[PDB]
Amino acid sequence: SLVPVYIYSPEYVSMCDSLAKIPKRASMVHSLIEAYALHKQMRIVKPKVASMEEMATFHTDAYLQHLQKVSQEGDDDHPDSIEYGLGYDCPATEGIFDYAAAIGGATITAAQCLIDGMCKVAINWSGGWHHAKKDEASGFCYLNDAVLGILRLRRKFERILYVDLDLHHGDGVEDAFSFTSKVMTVSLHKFSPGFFPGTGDVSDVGLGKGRYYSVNVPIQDGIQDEKYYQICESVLKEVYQAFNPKAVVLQLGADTIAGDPMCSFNMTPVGIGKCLKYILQWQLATLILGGGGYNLANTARCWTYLTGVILGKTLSSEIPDHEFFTAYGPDYVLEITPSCRPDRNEPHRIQQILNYIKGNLKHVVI
Ligand SMILES: Cn1cc(C(=O)Cc2ccccc2)cc1/C=C/C(=O)NO
Ligand SMILES: [K+]
Ligand SMILES: [K+]
Ligand SMILES: [Zn+2]
Ligand SMILES: [Zn+2]
């Protein structure tokens, strides 16, 4: 149809809530999307928990298995943990395996729907776990659903484009497809000394026949909706022309929005929204994902607003009373206001980058 597919299931939302770093976030988001009763304008779909075999299409058995053990326990001692990433920035708590599988399945489902012509846009705000390596958790990413969806997607579509708008660089997803030309990865993110993962400069382009098939736009603190769109809509224009994608997987981690603990970018869901609109306009099959977002209230407002955009709907400022109303204090409005920090993004260095890029995107043609 022309109607968007909204991957959802009360079981699933509960599952996602159990994640340490972002408790009750999944619920808060569905709850708010429901309060603006947008779900009514979408096609709900239950997540087909990823099979051991499906997850294994990108992750080593050794890893998936170890992730399983620990999940049915508590990583009792296991000094081998570090070998797989389980530690602090990826706590191997109990029953996370089911957690992973739940999410990875959802994203896979989303991709299935897109494949089966059931819709042009499939959503899974829980997904977006872009750091997970083929065999080693990373920055709260125990499973890389982002990649899985791309794989499942490549079944029907030839060239697939992955646009990562999370605050952090989408290393995991990028690596997975660093050596191929069938999948292109575009990532906007804060790049600085010490800032995790600290990978993906602009000189990062890919390897072998995957060279120039990995584009990275390093941004600096303070960037707002103004410049961000300029920068983004600029790159996405080139990428589109020189790549001609068949489908698109878009990660929209809200850890870039003003107010997020990450205190780096100074974006508001409206800006990210404009980027979303620009992509959607290509009317290719598109798989939407969540990801970072740690100022929960805000993360909810953001993704809800975006969901609105996806429906070409205009939401009212008044935050609809709902299960978490209290949380949107003290103004209870949808809009987010950019903090008052300077935008350390020198316009010279920027244009310098947008050329470096389009220049590399020149080869992609040739
Ligand atoms: C909150 N978080 C902490 C880490 C680290 O492991 C390390 C770190 C080290 C020095 C400065 C800042 C962060 C990674 C994340 C989030 C990733 C994310 O949301 N991906 O989508
Ligand atoms: K990113
Ligand atoms: K690539
Ligand atoms: Zn272990
Ligand atoms: Zn992030």
DSSP string, 303-364: HHHHHHHHTT----SB----TTGGGGTTT-BS-----S------HHHHHHHHHHHHHHHHHH
Which one-letter DSSP state was computed for residue 231?
H
Q: Are 267 and 258 in contact (CB under 8 A)?
A: yes
> Which amino acid, residue 266?
N
Instruction: Give kind and range of the element (H or E) at residue 161.
Output: strand 160-164
Tokens 């294994």 map to which residue? 56
CA 216/CA 361 separation, integer angstroms: 12
Left if phi > 0, otherwise alpha if psi is -120 to 50, otherwise beta: which for 200? left
> Which amino acid, residue 16?
C
130 C-beta closer than 6 A to ligand 1:
yes
CA 144/CA 49 separation, integer angstroms: 14
Domain of 312, in residue numbers = 1-366
Q: How far is the CA of 136 from the centre of ligand 1 (A)?
A: 15
Ligand 1 binding pocket mutation candidate from 196, 262, 298 (most atoms within 8 A of CB): 196
CA 248/CA 61 separation, integer angstroms: 28
Q: Is 204 annotated as a binding residue?
A: no
CA 279/CA 260 separation, integer angstroms: 24
In Å, how far from its chain's centre is CA 207? 23
In Å, how far from its chain's centre is CA 120? 18
DSSP labels, 244-272: --SEEEEE--STTBTT-TT----B-HHHH
With both helix axes pointing from N to C terminus, report the angle between 145-153 and 96-115 in degrees, rounded to the nearest 10. 30
322 is catalytic: no
CA 366/CA 77 separation, integer angstroms: 53
194 C-beta closer than 6 A to ligand 1:
yes
Q: Using the Cα atoms of residue 229, residue 315, residue 221 and residue 193 in order, give the sign of their dihedral.
A: negative
Instruction: Give kind and range of the element (H or E) at residue 298.
Output: helix 296-310
Strand order in the sheet with 43-45: 43-45, 5-7, 121-124, 285-289, 247-251, 160-164, 183-190, 214-219
> Which amino acid, residue 134?
K
Q: Is 221 annotated as a binding residue?
A: no
Q: How far is the CA of 155 from the centre of ligand 3 (A)?
A: 17
CA 142/CA 236 separation, integer angstroms: 29
CA 222/CA 343 separation, integer angstroms: 4
CA nearest neighbour of 343 among 225, 259, 234, 241:
225
127 C-beta closer than 6 A to ligand 1:
no
Longest pairwise C-alpha distance within the chain: 55
Q: Are 90 and 63 in contact (CB under 8 A)?
A: no
> Which amino acid, residue 93?
T
Q: Are 268 and 229 in contact (CB under 8 A)?
A: no
131 C-beta closer than 6 A to ligand 1:
yes
Residue nearest to atom 17 of ligand 1 (CA): 139
* C-alpha angle 288-289-290 in degrees, rounded to nearest 5: 140
* C-alpha angle 328-329-334 in degrees, rounded to nearest 5: 45
Facing residues of 124 across strands? 289
Q: Are 301 and 269 in contact (CB under 8 A)?
A: yes
CATH number of the structural domain spanning residue 209: 3.40.800.20
Resolution (Å units)? 3.3
Kindly report whether the peptide bond that precedes residue 330 is cis, defined as omega within 30 degrees of 0: yes
Q: How far is CA 110 from each of CA 48, 120, 131, 253, 340, rounded to the nearest angstrom?
A: 9, 10, 20, 17, 38
Per the structure, how many domains does the chain have? 1
Q: Which residues contact 51 (CB under 8 A, 6 or more apart)?
A: 101, 105
CA nearest neighbour of 162 among 197, 202, 209, 111:
111
Q: Are 187 and 174 in contact (CB under 8 A)?
A: yes
User: What b/e readout covers 265-284, taking b as 16+ CB neighbours within 10 angstroms?
Assistant: bbbbbbbbbebbeebbeeeb
- Beta carbons within 10 angstroms of residue 35's beta carbon: 19
Please give the number of the atom of ligand 1 that sits closest to the Cα of 130: 21
CA 285/CA 155 separation, integer angstroms: 13
Burial of residue 133, with CB atoms counted within 10 A of its CB: 0-12 exposed, 13-18 middle, 19 or more buried: buried
Indicate the SS3 state at residue 57: coil
Q: How far is CA 262 from each of CA 204, 252, 253, 265, 315, rounded to the nearest angstrom?
A: 24, 15, 12, 8, 27
What is the chain's Cα-based Rg? 19
Q: Which two tokens stand for residue 259?
A: 């107010």
139 C-beta closer than 6 A to ligand 1:
yes
Instruction: Give kind and range of the element (H or E) at residue 162.
Output: strand 160-164
Q: Which residues contact 120 (CB under 8 A, 6 or more apart)?
A: 2, 4, 114, 283, 284, 285, 286
- Tell me which method was used to determine the 3D structure: X-ray
CA 148/CA 287 separation, integer angstroms: 12
Q: Which two tokens stand for residue 138?
A: 């990373």
Q: How far is the CA of 245 from the centre of ligand 1 (A)?
A: 30
Which one-letter DSSP state was computed for residue 85?
T
Q: Is 89 annotated as a binding residue?
A: yes
Tokens 């410049």 map to which residue? 227
Indicate the SS3 state at residue 211: coil
